Design an enzyme around this catalytic site. Structure first.
Site, mmCIF file in Angstrom:
data_model
loop_
_atom_site.group_PDB
_atom_site.id
_atom_site.type_symbol
_atom_site.label_atom_id
_atom_site.label_comp_id
_atom_site.label_asym_id
_atom_site.label_seq_id
_atom_site.Cartn_x
_atom_site.Cartn_y
_atom_site.Cartn_z
ATOM 1 C CD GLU A 1 -2.969 0.893 -3.262
ATOM 2 O OE1 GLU A 1 -2.157 1.746 -2.529
ATOM 3 O OE2 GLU A 1 -3.843 1.421 -4.049
ATOM 4 C CG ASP B 1 -2.116 -1.009 1.157
ATOM 5 O OD1 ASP B 1 -2.553 -1.332 -0.023
ATOM 6 O OD2 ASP B 1 -2.239 -1.695 1.896
#
Ligand SMILES: OC[C@H]1O[C@H](O)[C@H](O)[C@@H](O)[C@@H]1O
Length: 607
Positions: A311, A269
């Site tokens: 991501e 992320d």
């Protein structure tokens, strides 16, 4: 540096019965790891000492890897995740089955659907109070108590592994919750951990950064530390300072501990923000990729069965770097999300323009060896239309299109729309796939004809994802055509977060209705299963087989090809039309001219 001394540091904690295989991998990958770390921290005075100490810790964690996983590391082949039988599913553990033990008991459901890759959204201990649906992580090494224990995680991964399912977990490496132990230690005045974050006494330095930084302010004043903390996202998420090797060391160990608990894939992320450099936008920096190369090398050595997934919701033109650039291509992330395709699918549907998809696929960067895409229709977030900015300007083959019009259509802000999404540049759209495809509207109007057509639209979008090289990811409930959940509206601390509209709790009563071929859930489930079944039997769809699109002069159609033997034809309009074989050079066989009914899809083995 002194390679043998470093190797010895790594080898120390290893079990003599497993040292050989591990050391073999160390010998072939360690140099890349060392070059990466040297480029990032080599100039530090503490570098050599830190490195020797960290490698010892790495070796010790390597030793602790369960035998079953060490065996997986030695038997699994590179590129495994791109095989035809791979089918993904993304969900919240609590919304899916309450707790991790609950998820384990629902594995049969996942098996029947054909799932081989399960992404459970943030399930690690999260910030008390607001934590953005778990994305403000308080402990990377422990499961959120309300979901279960680490033992439950181990029991879950063991059970999933039996069913042939690989667990993907989010690894929020750019920032931690402001109540993470490191943050608390910083709040208490521990200079060591305060340095795990970006902190400033005055706005002096922060302003210089701000001058070139882009709005996502980027700093939050914290009284306990009495300084401005870098907070790219919510004010309670403090950006980790990756220029500090101790941060890299501890996060790499955290990743490995998660891998030892059974995690097989890591959704990395907010990686674009990992490196900070004054004068720049502090995004997609060269050093950020170097960090990912270093982390990948660590897994290549210690847990090669694992995959790294980027991501990075950005246009596909900015994605190749994540698979590794230049000399490091193939040595970074294994997977990346094809968001452009996802957004293009919905735009094409709303505009009844298959030429938009031809544009996306015709320009999709070819996948490096052992790399693949994660294709999807929806997810836990709003649909970000801005990723299509470039395509929306049009080119020689595809006229321009309006992202504003597309977003207005899905927000049902325009007269004749069958969509029931909600607006969240161009603002994103919240809402479930069935709600956006017209299924919700058709049910609210009791229109049986409009419902059947809505079902076709939903299946069409998933058929596209299913023909792609990599892992097609179903968003929980789409296989049952679940619609919007307006319940968050009538809720204490949830009415402020519009994304809950598409974050419903699994409807297991509806899930049981899939056995009824005449029901809506059963009809959708059956058609998706048919596509999944066919996909698995087609070697031409493997990630190492080419992906392309044949240019057609009818803008309503989209022809996607895989390898040299597969063709998928799609009709993105509500009109019956046909595709002349002499336009795609075919005459093959039909799977499970060519006439395509409205929103129809046909798979052909052109050979
Ligand atoms: O920074 C917080 C954000 O991180 C990621 O983008 C998650 O996908 C998103 O749901 C979350 O809100």
């Amino acid at each position: 540096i002194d390679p043998p001394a470093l190797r010895a540091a790594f080898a120390g904690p290893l079990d003599p019965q497993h040292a050989e295989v591990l050391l073999s991998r160390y010998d072939q990958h360690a140099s890349r790891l060392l070059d990466a770390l040297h480029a990032l921290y080599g100039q530090r005075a503490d570098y050599a000492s830190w490195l020797a100490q960290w490698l010892g810790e790495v070796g010790d964690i390597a030793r602790q890897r369960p035998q079953a996983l060490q065996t997986l590391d030695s038997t699994r082949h590179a590129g495994w995740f791109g095989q035809p039988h791979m089918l993904g599913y993304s969900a919240y553990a609590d919304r899916f089955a309450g707790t991790l033990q609950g998820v384990a008991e629902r594995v049969p459901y996942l098996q029947e659907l054909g799932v081989r890759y399960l992404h459970l959204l943030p399930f690690l201990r999260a910030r008390a109070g607001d934590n953005d649906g778990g994305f403000a992580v308080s402990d990377y090494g422990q499961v959120e108590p309300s979901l279960g224990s680490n033992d439950d995680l181990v029991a879950l991964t063991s059970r999933l592994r039996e069913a042939g399912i690989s667990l993907c977990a989010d690894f929020v490496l750019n920032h931690t919750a402001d109540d993470h132990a490191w943050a608390q230690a910083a709040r208490a005045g521990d200079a060591r951990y305060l340095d795990y974050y970006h902190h400033f006494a005055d706005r002096t330095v922060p302003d210089r950064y701000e001058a070139t930084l882009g709005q996502v302010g980027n700093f939050t004043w914290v009284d306990d530390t009495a300084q401005w903390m870098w907070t790219t996202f919510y004010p309670y998420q403090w950006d980790l300072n990756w220029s500090n090797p101790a941060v890299f060391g501890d996060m790499a160990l955290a990743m490995l501990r998660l891998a030892n608990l059974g995690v097989e894939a890591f959704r990395l992320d907010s990686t674009a923000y990992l490196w900070k450099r004054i004068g720049t936008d502090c995004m997609n920096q060269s050093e950020a990729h170097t960090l990912l190369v270093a982390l990948r090398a660590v897994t290549d050595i210690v847990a090669p069965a694992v995959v790294m997934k980027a991501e990075a919701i950005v246009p596909m033109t900015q994605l190749p770097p994540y698979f590794g650039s230049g000399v490091d291509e193939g040595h970074e992330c294994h997977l990346a999300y094809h968001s452009t395709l996802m957004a293009a699918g919905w735009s094409a549907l709303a505009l009844q323009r298959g030429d938009i998809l031809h544009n996306v696929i015709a320009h999709s960067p070819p996948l490096p060896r052992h790399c693949a895409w994660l294709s999807y229709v929806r997810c836990h977030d709003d649909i970000g239309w801005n990723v299509l900015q470039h395509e929306a300007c049009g080119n020689a083959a595809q006229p321009p299109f309006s992202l504003r019009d597309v977003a207005r259509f899905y927000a049902n802000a325009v007269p004749g729309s069958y969509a029931r999404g909600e607006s969240f540049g161009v603002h994103g759209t919240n809402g479930m796939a069935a709600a956006l495809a017209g299924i919700q509207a058709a049910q609210e109007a009791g229109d049986a004809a409009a419902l059947a057509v809505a079902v076709d639209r939903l299946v069409l979008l998933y058929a596209i994802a299913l023909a792609m090289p990599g892992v097609p990811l179903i968003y929980m409930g789409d296989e049952l055509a679940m619609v919007n959940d307006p319940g968050y509206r009538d809720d204490p601390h949830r009415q402020h977060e519009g994304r809950w509209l598409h974050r419903p709790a699994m409807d297991w009563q509806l899930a049981a209705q899939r056995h009824d071929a005449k029901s809506l859930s059963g009809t959708v489930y059956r058609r998706l299963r048919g596509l999944i079944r066919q996909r698995a039997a087609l070697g031409a769809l493997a990630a190492d087989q080419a992906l392309a699109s044949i240019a057609l002069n009818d803008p309503r159609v989209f022809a996607l090809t895989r390898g040299d033997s597969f063709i998928a034809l799609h009709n993105f309009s509500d009109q019956l039309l046909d595709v002349e074989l002499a336009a795609i050079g075919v005459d093959g066989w039909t799977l499970l001219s060519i006439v395509l009914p409205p929103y129809g899809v046909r798979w052909l083995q052109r050979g």
